[PDB]
Amino acid sequence: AVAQSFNMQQQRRFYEALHDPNLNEEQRNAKIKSIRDD
Numbered sequence: 001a002v003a004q005s006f007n008m009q010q011q012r013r014f015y016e017a018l019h020d021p022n023l024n025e026e027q028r029n030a031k032i033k034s035i036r037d038d
Contacts, residue, residue: 010035 017031
């Protein structure tokens, strides 16, 4: 594919970051970015 590293595994931490309001904007976007990069 375009790359596809561990994105599928990370999908749960990705979902967590996106949905979870307790994790603030900075935390969320940092996780999202790192996951998309990996």
